[PDB]
Amino acid sequence: YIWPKGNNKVRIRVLIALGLLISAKILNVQVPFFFKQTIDSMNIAWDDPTVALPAAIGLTILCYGVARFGSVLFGELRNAVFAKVAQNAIRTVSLQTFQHLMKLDLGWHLSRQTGGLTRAMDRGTKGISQVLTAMVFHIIPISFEISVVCGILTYQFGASFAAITFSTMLLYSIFTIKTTAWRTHFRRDANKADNKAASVALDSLINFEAVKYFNNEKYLADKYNGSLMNYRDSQIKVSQSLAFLNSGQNLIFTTALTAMMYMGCTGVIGGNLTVGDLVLINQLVFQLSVPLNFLGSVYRDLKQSLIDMETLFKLRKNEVKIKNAERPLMLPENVPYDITFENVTFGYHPDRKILKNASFTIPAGWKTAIVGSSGSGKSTILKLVFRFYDPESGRILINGRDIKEYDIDALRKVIGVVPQDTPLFNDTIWENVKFGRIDATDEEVITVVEKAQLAPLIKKLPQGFDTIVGERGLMISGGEKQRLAIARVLLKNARIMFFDEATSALDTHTEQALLRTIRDNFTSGSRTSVYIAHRLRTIADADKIIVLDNGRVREEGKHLELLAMPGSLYRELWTIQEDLDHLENELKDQQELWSHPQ
Amino acid sequence: YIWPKGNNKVRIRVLIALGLLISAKILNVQVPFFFKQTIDSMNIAWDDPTVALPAAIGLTILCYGVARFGSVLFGELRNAVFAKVAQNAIRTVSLQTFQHLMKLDLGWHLSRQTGGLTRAMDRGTKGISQVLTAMVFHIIPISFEISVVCGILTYQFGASFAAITFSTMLLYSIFTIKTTAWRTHFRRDANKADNKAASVALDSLINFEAVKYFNNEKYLADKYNGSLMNYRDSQIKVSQSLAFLNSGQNLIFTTALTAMMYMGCTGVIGGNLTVGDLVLINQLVFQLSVPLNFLGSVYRDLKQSLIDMETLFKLRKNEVKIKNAERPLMLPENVPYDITFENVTFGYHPDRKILKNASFTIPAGWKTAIVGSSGSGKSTILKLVFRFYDPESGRILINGRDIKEYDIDALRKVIGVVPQDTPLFNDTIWENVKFGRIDATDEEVITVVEKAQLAPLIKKLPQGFDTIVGERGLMISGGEKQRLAIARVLLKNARIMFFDEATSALDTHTEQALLRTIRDNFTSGSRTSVYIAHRLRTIADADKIIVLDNGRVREEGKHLELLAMPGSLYRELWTIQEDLDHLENELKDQQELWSHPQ
């Protein structure tokens, strides 16, 4: 577990904290001596009431202060150092988890709830500032000080005292915890009712019409008042239990202290103890009560943080499935790449075979389209080319070589993707376009936004390039979004290009515009382009069309040749698809007639 | 004016805490006397060291305990009593806020963001338990004790002491706040960056594919590390400045205390002051340090909670626009209700009129339907009849009386609504059906669930009637929901009945089933039914059809007679509606073909 330190001088700082820790408590126990000695050093003659104060004691009362102040300053300095340790561990862990997170496989990321992960990794770091704080700011200081104090008690007043001091500390613990763990049975009940009343008031605000259309209002009001009164009663039991907790804690010390001052007064009669000795055993034992109040909030905290920190550790336990083998190839530099599928059988889970023994070629320089109705399996080409997944049977070759043997990072570099639904980042657009390639000159970025015909957006946008998009920002049209994606893939300048269903922008008028801006930028310039559509009309000018059916390659040719082929599937698809376009275009037209008055 | 006093004898409870407060600092200040007395009364002979302890002082050390414990015990009790005051005010405010909110008009409820209201009142109560605690648990107790201690000092030790005690108090405050206000610019910066890292890591996990489809990864890891180091470097400055604060605060009391032991020891030379008196001025002035360390978390809270208490109060400021006049009519008793529109002009925002000078009669007992294409203004009939809004020009009468003169509750009680989208409540269905009329017998609720043909749903449902429906529960189909809304209006048994676009259940077979269930329960039984439809096909059996266009009543008659009327608008609407239904029926057929892998 743990092990934030390995080979460095951060442990230098760690010793320093401990020195400042030890040396802050020494200065603390030293304070009451200076109070006792100063008391005794005044229990004398003074029949000349005009004498100045002996410096011999003037010094001793400075000592009091510069030991009182000394104790705190070294405790603060202990803290300020160790934070430079703590904040360092969190920064280092939060990154290595993130970094290892993306080295993880796609199948993994898809099962995992992204929020279950964002919490797990955040609440993972909280559980470190919870557990390193528990030790260094509380337990170790309270361990040393209690050790030292009972030590001195044995030594200077007798184990008679030390016995009851340490005993009281233990009684304090095994009352604080046995009460505190008990008293969560209220907060977990208070914020319960708080939520009950929270939900009643919310329905009553959303469904405002619904309560209006009926009687009620009063029904929901004293339904609220019901939940409100449950919560009042519950919070009342919290404030009350707290009183009991604080009174029980004080009664422990007050008697512990009171009974000792008795014990001290016998030693003043027995002549063994001075009068300062009374102040000493009082103020000595009292100085332990202060930090003892904190270490009662914890216990559960230490329980919850023990696991919440492991769950964050457990993440990096996860194994990487898709890795490049030993002696991995980079390979070809300046040739156009072709793609071939040899008997590829693949799906997610052996129950679902999606690609059933698929074989075909995607030649270099060409525009190849891959079409098929619902269930075809075109839906999984790119993912296999990008080795996101690996095929269960059969293999996939680029330029005669299996891509398994290629360097998995090298491969992915030459492939550009315009995805069906583009992601935006909570950032500037100018930072979203630049996402294509980081080292882009400002000039490159403008041209690419120009080439894509994204200009009208930034002009229409008041805050221009600096406008914030993302879920937490300004939302833009699908068209402007897909336009941005074209922009990105222009910057990346890949050799192989995928357009995975690029134009399911649910507006035909907008699809037209996008398909043109694409036919301008990606025309046969020794880029090998794969188009994956289900609207064949948008890929009719392809150099090769591969049509899949229930996971297997049925036909394979050009548009005009596939259409003319007797008994072709393409013609069935072209026909329904086209009959459909006329229909939903015709239906849109009539919705319009009914859309406005007459 | 949080008004802890009003008209009840809860102000008796209020005094007790204050009493418990007053009698708790007294028990506190006496503790150094009993410690002093015990010191002086032991500074004597004892030349017989076998004597038992004199009771005169055994009592003096008892007095110490039962004053130390008593002081706290009264402070705990002051708090547990006063919670029973605080918690009560929140409840009282939480209800009248809730109650008055529903007296507000639909337009108000529609503009205000509903979560903003839920935050406002949740954050509203925080600012009361914060300002009631700040007063009774801190400011007053520490003001009272400072006075008492400064009283004692001037009285028994001279203004010499009081001068520097009180000065230390001010020096303490007007440093802490002046420091704390400075040091907030770090937590407001740490959690700033923490949110930056938050969004980075989140974006890199949702758009995990995008970062994979591109270069980057490394780009995003050290975009995180930037924020991570922004946060680390920020969090240290939090710990560093905190150390300064606690050190700076400790310096203040340490010199103040030390300097007084000087000033005290000189009064021991002058024979004026005993040695216990050294303990006395120390511990008295020390016992003022304890609660002062908390009272530094405030000042800003006192500001933030002051406005968060004011915005929550600003709510009841809001004017109720739709209110009944003085001496409002209830009226007609056992007659069927009719509805008539006299020159009604209405819109939201006076510039954009929806209903333009509409006049028509909705005769009693009949089934009246109101149809029209978009812009018609049928879209706003119900809202006006329910006095949600009031017409700009013209009036609306039920049985000859302007509905403005009716008791707005009396009016709304006789109108039942089956809305286009029924709302669900987070509760059982049985409680959602019973919502129609609360005082319904359990049997009544059964007959209604039967009549509505809702029975099949509760049988199909796992936990039967007790099943939890709602957003944070189990969602049911539109058809089942509209089936439940029909149920509710049966329990209500209203005299006037509106079916606002009830069956735009985007599933036709389910529409047909519903219309049958409606036509069975609502047959002219001295109930006057108004249907607002846009598929005229569903209201052809009406007794009167009123057709609106661009806000004005164009034609008005029966189904067959309107159809036959030459140049009628109804035949035009009938025609578009007919073709439209025919198209989307054909389009349903064609999508199915492409929907399957054959």
Ligand SMILES: N[C@@H](CCC(=O)N[C@@H](CS)C(=O)NCC(=O)O)C(=O)O
């Ligand atoms: N001396 C106090 C510090 C009081 C204080 O201002 N604490 C900060 C920590 S930086 C805080 O967040 N207080 C609550 C707030 O101001 O919202 C303590 O350490 O217990």
